[PDB]
Amino acid sequence: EYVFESPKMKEILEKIKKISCAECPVLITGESGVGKEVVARLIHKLSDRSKEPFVALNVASIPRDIFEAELFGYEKGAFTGAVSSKEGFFELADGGTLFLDEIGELSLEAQAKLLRVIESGKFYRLGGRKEIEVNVRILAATNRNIKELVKEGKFREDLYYRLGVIEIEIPPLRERKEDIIPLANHFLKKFSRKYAKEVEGFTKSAQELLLSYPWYGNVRELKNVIERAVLFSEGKFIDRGELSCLV
Amino acid sequence: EYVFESPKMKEILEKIKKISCAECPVLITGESGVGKEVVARLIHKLSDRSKEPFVALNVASIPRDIFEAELFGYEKGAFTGAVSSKEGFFELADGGTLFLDEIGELSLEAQAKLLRVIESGKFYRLGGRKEIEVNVRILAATNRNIKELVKEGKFREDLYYRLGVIEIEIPPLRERKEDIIPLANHFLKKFSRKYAKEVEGFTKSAQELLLSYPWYGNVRELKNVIERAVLFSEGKFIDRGELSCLV
Amino acid sequence: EYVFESPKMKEILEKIKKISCAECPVLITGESGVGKEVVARLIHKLSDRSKEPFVALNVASIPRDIFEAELFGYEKGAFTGAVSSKEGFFELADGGTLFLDEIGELSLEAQAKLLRVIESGKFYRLGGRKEIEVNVRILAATNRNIKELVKEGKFREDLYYRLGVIEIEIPPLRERKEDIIPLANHFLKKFSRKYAKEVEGFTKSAQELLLSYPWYGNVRELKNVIERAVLFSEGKFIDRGELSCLV
């Protein structure tokens, strides 16, 4: 029910469908709020692994101190914790796909811990003495410029080229004008339902404006703008005037 | 109890009643001491959740070390934490409202931690392997210009669009002259009673001064000036002369 | 046992007596050694709260790391913190008065933490989920000019309006000529007693020069100068010569 229109955005859809079967690293890039999360969620859904669990993690929100332990896991006892052994996030995602959003904001110290893990697909639980092997597809996302961080010495060069084997860029909305209106309508359906309103669609006078506003917040800002409009709506349609106070 | 007399403020008064039913995040701006907290607490009382918990947080007062742990919560066995597991502030506010005050003073590193939590209402407990989802309405406030801070790279662009579903600016007092006297009189009533004094109201010449002093501290300054005035009053009324030493 | 002889100090002394019933924060300013500390104790003794605890604190002296914990207090578990629950200085002063000297030396980042505590008198213990409310009258003092610093952006504007309910400035010593001699005798009386000397009073020639001194160190400097002078005293009276080497 989602929207893929325009020559630019439709082209990406083909790329994704072909790599659905692949076991190899993925690097997703673009501004935040362009729909990168949907794509990340989509690759898993379209893959040979569609029925398995999808584990969402906000990286960098993990403290550096428990990062390795909280991720890879630990056994019973073994450096003053609990009594019983506890699974790590990788083993829970074993056979599945793990999505790390905003990887580019990760600390230099933490990257090194997962670094050796990337190539071997093997690791040691903290305090565990038996090497474990798991099968996990890695997905990554960031709203920032990764190319820059490497040049600034803020990002390891070797990690970029390992994850950046395949790189998929999402362009902003201002470079996809054809996609604007169909999306706006999709949100109307959702918001009209939520707040139980009588709204149907937008007047043409309103529609012309969206194209001239170069949308710095992309999809994420739009979704918010519509939600505002539906709430203050009176009739079933929204005029340019109701947007004017919004802009 | 609460005072709104003004063109500017009455417009806002209407705005709140419509989102009383709304489930989405709110971002309040204005100088500090214009009543941002009153607005935040009021939305809750006027909403359908008015009977549920309301959690007030300074968020600048939170220590960096426990920031992650004290917020989301943890399961027993996170690097020798306690014995027992403890819920987080998000879980405590479930069904209720969570207010993050003076958010604009937060460091970029910390802002990012909150990213996945706001929109999805989902997160992971520390040491927990089970994804938790809770229902909490989020309000935020700051006394600085956040739109400018983003442009200066001092505040995350992606976080702004998550909280900024609704944006409400509070105008200063000098742009609300009609609010001055009602506010001034209301504060006097409580203080005269509290400190058991004989004071009732203001002389005409005194009232004229309040209108001419362009109030840089806004409403918060007013309350104090009356409190200063009430304590030193002799007769039942306050003249312009008694204010002269205060201004 | 305290000395107030002067037009300047007697006027202020009256103000203190009038606010004895008031429950609100006070801001003391002045050069170092002018008695800013004395007033803070005096307000307490003359107020209705005079019989309850008076807590003296160098706020600048609080290390940043435990700054939050030592102030608000904490529950048992805090990253292997203690065993037992412990109250903070705000809770310790409940029903009493809390005196923060050198408020002006705090970093902008740290000041932000104190905001909700000052006005609401409310906070959350560390690891505690129940909002606590305390009753504390706040007294503050600083050797800096706050009105200037705010304009220089070196001090939070919003915090000033929270603490600044009552503002007391106080003049240096050179602008109080009447206090010099009465004070000098008290210290001489004190030190002659302490150090068992034969000294009684001052020669006429000595006294005239002393009054014409700029006194950058104010009363504290006097106390030191008398202590220095008494030790080297020979006769029962002190001449201009023993003081002359200091000026």
Next chain:
Amino acid sequence: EYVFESPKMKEILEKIKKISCAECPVLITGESGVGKEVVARLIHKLSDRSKEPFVALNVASIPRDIFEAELFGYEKGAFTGAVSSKEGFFELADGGTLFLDEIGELSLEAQAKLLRVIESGKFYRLGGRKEIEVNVRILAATNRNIKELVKEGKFREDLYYRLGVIEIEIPPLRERKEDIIPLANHFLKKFSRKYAKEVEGFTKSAQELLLSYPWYGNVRELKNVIERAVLFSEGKFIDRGELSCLV
């Protein structure tokens, strides 16, 4: 075993004996190696506390992170302060004398922490709820020009007036010619004893040179020069030639 043959140092010696009874802080200044430590160590021996504790401290050797803790002391709790409670240096010096060497090397921010402690002799232990009071004589030393530092804003004026009750200036060695030879013989005595040598005294020509030698390092340099000579000595006396080589 200490040497004072100079007119200036003899006057100071008298000055010291008169102030032996005082309980108040002393500030010693001068070039390094002029004997600032012997005087400080001596005053204790001549005071009423000569049998009481003498605490020697390099305030510069205290690391920034525990500066607060190592000084005031701490209770089991607080930091993750492990298990045992520990006294602070101030509690250690109660009834005794506290010697702070190289006070002049403190960072302006750090100076402020000890401020209330110096004058009041009062503080709170870390995690402690009972105010502790001690009676401590404070001694301080610096190799820097302190009068200058205040004027440049590099040293707080407020601390100076707390510490600066008694100020003792030690002149360099080049301004005490009378002290040179008596000192030299004493140093000759010790090293001749330690290294079991045959040396007795100086040639007439050599002694003259020492007097014309602008000692920049003062006594500390002399001691070293003597130590070199005793080691390399052959006969019972040292000629100008043995010194000519140095340097």
Next chain:
Amino acid sequence: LLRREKDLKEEEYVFESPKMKEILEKIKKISCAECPVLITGESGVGKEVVARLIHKLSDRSKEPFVALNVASIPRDIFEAELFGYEKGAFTGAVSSKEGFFELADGGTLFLDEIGELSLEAQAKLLRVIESGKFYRLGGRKEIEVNVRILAATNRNIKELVKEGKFREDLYYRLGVIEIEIPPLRERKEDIIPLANHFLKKFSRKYAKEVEGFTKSAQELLLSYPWYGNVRELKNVIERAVLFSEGKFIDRGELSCLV
């Protein structure tokens, strides 16, 4: 065979120079001395060797010799690893721990690359160097230890003092005895004996047939103003032996090295 290993006779060492011969004698005089020593010179001149030697000829030769790169100590634990620390006062460890100073008690302490220290860091050592006294971190008992200090730097230290880049008061604590090591280019006599010594060592390890140098080669070595000094030589000789074929080395083999 590899790098003796039972070291009967010997690692030995070469001193044939007038300057170095004079310095060797000076050392013999301080064998009884308990006082700090300051060694200066270009890099690779044997400053470490002298330091190890002063220890060997002293009365403390049988007691501990603590070798330390001070520059390598982290700023954060610098105070702690040095003076030592008690059970608390950090979030450090559990148990109390001795410092390197307390470890060298009765012995000799060698501080290498002292000249690279930051002014903030130098000030901390003051009471410890001259008085030999300090307080352990979190400790309330004043500790007193007996330690002879040796120091080294590859820079000009008097210069640093005059430039305000090195604390003056500290200089007079360490600088009781000061030893300036001249470079090799000012010791011409040491050149040939050294090269021969290195050649023999490497010939054994890497089993080659080389014995000595041609007359033409020796001339070049003398005209090479050795900016890396002996350390450069040791490397240069080691380089030649591996690539050596016959028993002698000509000037041609050196040209690619210089």
Next chain:
Amino acid sequence: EYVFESPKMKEILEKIKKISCAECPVLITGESGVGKEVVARLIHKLSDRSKEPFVALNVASIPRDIFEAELFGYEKGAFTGAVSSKEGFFELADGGTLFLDEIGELSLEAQAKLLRVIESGKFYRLGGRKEIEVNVRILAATNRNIKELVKEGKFREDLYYRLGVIEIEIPPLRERKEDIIPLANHFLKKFSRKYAKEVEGFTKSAQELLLSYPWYGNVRELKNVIERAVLFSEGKFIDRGELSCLV
């Protein structure tokens, strides 16, 4: 299985064969991605220690805070953190060979710490009082010309003399014409195998681009472009079109 064709690449292999017995540090120079690690990795395989461990490390990438700890290792405690004892990379490489990558990108300050370690192979564990001694062969790499860099004061002169015994450069690619083609095919074999593809070899049209030289990223770019090309391959042979699409 490594590819050496060009005369430059073939001659160097012979040089190594002679020094296989040598135990001394090595200095490798050339552009990034020229095979410095492979040359280095081969040397180990050819050495007397070839059967012992080989430790690869990027030095410039280590964070300053843990730089010392991860390198020398540490005993339990002696740090704020670190429950567990840790071997260092030096001790981990004991009896083996240690490869330091991108030394030329290392901070000047960090270089000074390594001095005694390189030549003497001795150090003290962090918090350990027992001296550690190891037998380790040194390998070094840089993307810059070091002899020049020292003269610019960007690299310590004394450290160079430790690593710079033998200096061997490598041409990037452009002076090796013969190595280009054999390499590309070698990867096709692995990548066709790894991802189970139908690919066999390259068409003549593909090769024409390969002969169009300008590889600014040298060999490192090649491996990635081929890895990229194989995934996007359609037929059993690859035309210029999938390669043309990148650069």
